[PDB]
Design an enzyme around this catalytic site. Structure first.
Site, PDB file in Angstrom:
ATOM      1  CE  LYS A 178      18.279  98.116  50.020  1.00 31.17           C
ATOM      2  NZ  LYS A 178      19.713  98.226  50.359  1.00 31.17           N
ATOM      3  CG  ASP A 215      28.825 100.312  49.113  1.00 31.63           C
ATOM      4  OD1 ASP A 215      29.642 100.963  48.425  1.00 31.63           O
ATOM      5  OD2 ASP A 215      27.687  99.997  48.716  1.00 31.63           O
ATOM      6  CB  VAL A 269      12.027 108.098  47.839  1.00 30.99           C
ATOM      7  CG1 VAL A 269      10.733 108.785  48.192  1.00 30.99           C
ATOM      8  CG2 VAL A 269      12.404 107.083  48.916  1.00 30.99           C
ATOM      9  N   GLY A 270      13.320 105.675  45.464  1.00 33.79           N
ATOM     10  CA  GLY A 270      14.539 105.009  44.992  1.00 33.79           C
ATOM     11  C   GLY A 270      14.182 103.685  44.352  1.00 33.79           C
ATOM     12  N   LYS A 271      14.773 103.408  43.188  1.00 36.40           N
ATOM     13  CA  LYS A 271      14.615 102.138  42.434  1.00 36.40           C
ATOM     14  C   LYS A 271      15.975 101.843  41.828  1.00 36.40           C
ATOM     15  N   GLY A 272      16.523 100.667  42.101  1.00 35.00           N
ATOM     16  CA  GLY A 272      17.862 100.263  41.651  1.00 35.00           C
ATOM     17  C   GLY A 272      17.895  98.774  41.394  1.00 35.00           C
ATOM     18  N   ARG A 273      19.086  98.234  41.191  1.00 36.47           N
ATOM     19  CA  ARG A 273      19.312  96.772  41.165  1.00 36.47           C
ATOM     20  C   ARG A 273      19.081  96.226  42.593  1.00 36.47           C
ATOM     21  N   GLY A 295      16.758  96.742  44.577  1.00 37.61           N
ATOM     22  CA  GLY A 295      15.327  96.785  44.911  1.00 37.61           C
ATOM     23  C   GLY A 295      14.809  98.209  44.882  1.00 37.61           C
ATOM     24  CD  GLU A 296      10.211  98.935  43.624  1.00 38.15           C
ATOM     25  OE1 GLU A 296       9.289  98.921  44.457  1.00 38.15           O
ATOM     26  OE2 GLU A 296      10.055  98.704  42.399  1.00 38.15           O
TER      27      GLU A 296
HETATM   28  C1  LIG Z   1      20.695 104.879  51.315  1.00 45.43           C
HETATM   29  O1  LIG Z   1      19.901 103.739  51.723  1.00 45.43           O
HETATM   30  C2  LIG Z   1      18.674 103.905  52.307  1.00 45.43           C
HETATM   31  C3  LIG Z   1      17.980 105.114  52.295  1.00 45.43           C
HETATM   32  C4  LIG Z   1      16.733 105.228  52.932  1.00 45.43           C
HETATM   33  C5  LIG Z   1      16.017 106.546  52.908  1.00 45.43           C
HETATM   34  C6  LIG Z   1      15.653 107.074  54.150  1.00 45.43           C
HETATM   35  N1  LIG Z   1      15.065 108.273  54.231  1.00 45.43           N
HETATM   36  C7  LIG Z   1      14.772 108.941  53.110  1.00 45.43           C
HETATM   37  C8  LIG Z   1      15.078 108.457  51.828  1.00 45.43           C
HETATM   38  C9  LIG Z   1      14.713 109.375  50.677  1.00 45.43           C
HETATM   39  C10 LIG Z   1      13.559 110.128  50.733  1.00 45.43           C
HETATM   40  C11 LIG Z   1      13.224 111.011  49.678  1.00 45.43           C
HETATM   41  C12 LIG Z   1      14.048 111.175  48.589  1.00 45.43           C
HETATM   42  C13 LIG Z   1      13.714 112.123  47.474  1.00 45.43           C
HETATM   43  C14 LIG Z   1      12.237 112.051  47.032  1.00 45.43           C
HETATM   44  C15 LIG Z   1      11.393 113.317  47.275  1.00 45.43           C
HETATM   45  N2  LIG Z   1      12.079 114.519  46.730  1.00 45.43           N
HETATM   46  C16 LIG Z   1      11.621 114.735  45.342  1.00 45.43           C
HETATM   47  C17 LIG Z   1      13.564 114.462  46.755  1.00 45.43           C
HETATM   48  C18 LIG Z   1      14.068 113.539  47.861  1.00 45.43           C
HETATM   49  C19 LIG Z   1      15.212 110.423  48.517  1.00 45.43           C
HETATM   50  C20 LIG Z   1      15.554 109.553  49.582  1.00 45.43           C
HETATM   51  C21 LIG Z   1      15.717 107.212  51.726  1.00 45.43           C
HETATM   52  C22 LIG Z   1      16.060 106.586  50.383  1.00 45.43           C
HETATM   53  C23 LIG Z   1      16.214 104.112  53.544  1.00 45.43           C
HETATM   54  C24 LIG Z   1      16.898 102.885  53.536  1.00 45.43           C
HETATM   55  O2  LIG Z   1      16.418 101.708  54.124  1.00 45.43           O
HETATM   56  C25 LIG Z   1      15.030 101.636  54.463  1.00 45.43           C
HETATM   57  C26 LIG Z   1      18.119 102.785  52.883  1.00 45.43           C
HETATM   58  O3  LIG Z   1      18.834 101.599  52.853  1.00 45.43           O
HETATM   59  C27 LIG Z   1      19.460 101.145  54.045  1.00 45.43           C
END
Ligand SMILES: COc1cc(-c2cncc(-c3ccc(C4CCN(C)CC4)cc3)c2C)cc(OC)c1OC
Ligand SMILES: COc1cc(-c2cncc(-c3ccc(C4CCN(C)CC4)cc3)c2C)cc(OC)c1OC
Ligand SMILES: COc1cc(-c2cncc(-c3ccc(C4CCN(C)CC4)cc3)c2C)cc(OC)c1OC
Length: 286
Positions: A35, A134, A14-18, A20-21
């Site tokens: 993460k 941040d 659900v995320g890819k950056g510098r 990590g993922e």
């Molecule tokens: C900011 O940072 C952190 C974030 C998270 C995190 C926790 N819940 C949900 C998410 C997520 C889920 C789903 C989507 C998309 C994909 C599906 N759809 C098409 C639209 C929505 C985006 C984001 C995330 C990225 C966890 C982290 O650590 C484990 C993070 O770092 C501390």
């Protein structure tokens, strides 16, 4: 004596950056976020892990900690942070394709202020005071109940080589006058960033049938991936601040929010509102 089920199924990236993922994962039926850190950003895993080993934060507006995992591999160390999973994604994501009404806008910004005041204030018995360093709309998640939570304590500082995102840096960070030995300095950097987030959200609140398009702070005066110098010239030298649209002054909520964001953006850090004063002001709006 007992099985310790550590298997996590990584289902979807659900995320890819510098950095990590981030993955949606599954543990024992329960959705989790995983993460996976780049070697580039190992110190962010260490700092978040050190903080949670110091104080197990538990707050509705702080992303919920589940686990820090270090695994030995062939010729590398693998670092995972496991948290609650918020399927609606980041506030940045959410604001692109959603508009807000008065109640949802206030609920979002008061939930952020709530999480931030929880970080900032020392509790005796408790928790150290914490500054985030941040804060931005990509580091805030939208929960299904309409409140948000604050994520990423990889830069956090506690009181009793990563730097912040340049677009959100306060003037004293950009002009290198910040008093680095003073904890209150770091709270005031977070308040500046909070004011920019409050502007990003308020733009998406409808009034009299009008809304602004999603834009990041300073979208009209700096490039994508602005340099430190680009930001210093805007924020420090020219002393620019985000535009308040005229249409806000027809709406009592947006008029009050514009005043609040002004009081987060003073050049003099000690003039800025505290997170606790922002909460009180938000509870008196509407
Ligand atoms: C900011 O940072 C952190 C974030 C998270 C995190 C926790 N819940 C949900 C998410 C997520 C889920 C789903 C989507 C998309 C994909 C599906 N759809 C098409 C639209 C929505 C985006 C984001 C995330 C990225 C966890 C982290 O650590 C484990 C993070 O770092 C501390
Ligand atoms: C090591 O690693 C991971 C472990 C787990 C996990 C799995 N089952 C059970 C546990 C558990 C929790 C707590 C106790 C208590 C029992 C009572 N006593 C008084 C103190 C100890 C025992 C067992 C854990 C912690 C999940 C993981 O991922 C979600 C792990 O990997 C990060
Ligand atoms: C890390 O995360 C999760 C862990 C668990 C989990 C698994 N086995 C055992 C436990 C447990 C049992 C008992 C004690 C205490 C109770 C009394 N006290 C005085 C001393 C000992 C602590 C822990 C837990 C909490 C479940 C989870 O979700 C359902 C987790 O979240 C994903």
């Amino acid at each position: 004596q007992r099985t310790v089920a550590r298997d996590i199924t990584l289902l979807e990236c659900v995320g890819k950056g510098r950095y990590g993922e981030v993955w949606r994962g599954s543990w024992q039926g329960e959705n989790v976020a995983v993460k996976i850190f780049s070697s580039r950003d190992e110190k962010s895993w260490f700092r978040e892990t050190e903080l949670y080993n110091t104080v197990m934060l538990r707050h509705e507006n702080i992303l919920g900690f589940i686990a820090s995992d270090m695994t030995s591999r062939h010729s590398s160390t693998q670092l995972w942070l496991i948290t609650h999973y918020h399927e609606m994604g980041s506030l940045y994501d959410y604001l692109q394709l959603t508009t807000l009404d008065t109640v949802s806008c206030l609920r979002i910004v008061l939930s952020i202020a709530s999480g931030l005041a929880h970080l900032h204030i020392e509790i005796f018995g408790g928790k150290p005071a914490i500054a985030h360093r941040d804060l931005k709309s990509k580091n805030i998640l939208v929960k299904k109940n309409g409140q948000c939570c604050i994520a990423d304590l990889g830069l956090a500082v506690m009181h009793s080589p990563r730097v912040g995102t340049k677009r959100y840096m306060a003037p004293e960070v950009l002009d290198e006058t910040i008093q680095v030995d003073c904890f209150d300095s770091y709270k005031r950097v977070d308040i500046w960033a909070f004011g920019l987030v409050l502007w990003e959200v308020a733009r998406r609140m409808v009034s009299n049938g009008i809304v602004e398009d999603y834009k990041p702070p300073f979208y009209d005066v700096v490039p994508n991936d602005p340099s430190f110098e680009d930001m210093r010239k805007v924020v420090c030298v020219d002393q620019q601040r985000p535009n308040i649209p005229n249409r806000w002054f027809s709406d009592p909520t947006l008029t009050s929010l514009a005043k609040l964001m002004k009081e987060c953006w003073y050049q003099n850090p000690s003039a800025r509102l505290t997170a606790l004063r922002i909460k009180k002001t938000l509870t008196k709006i509407d």
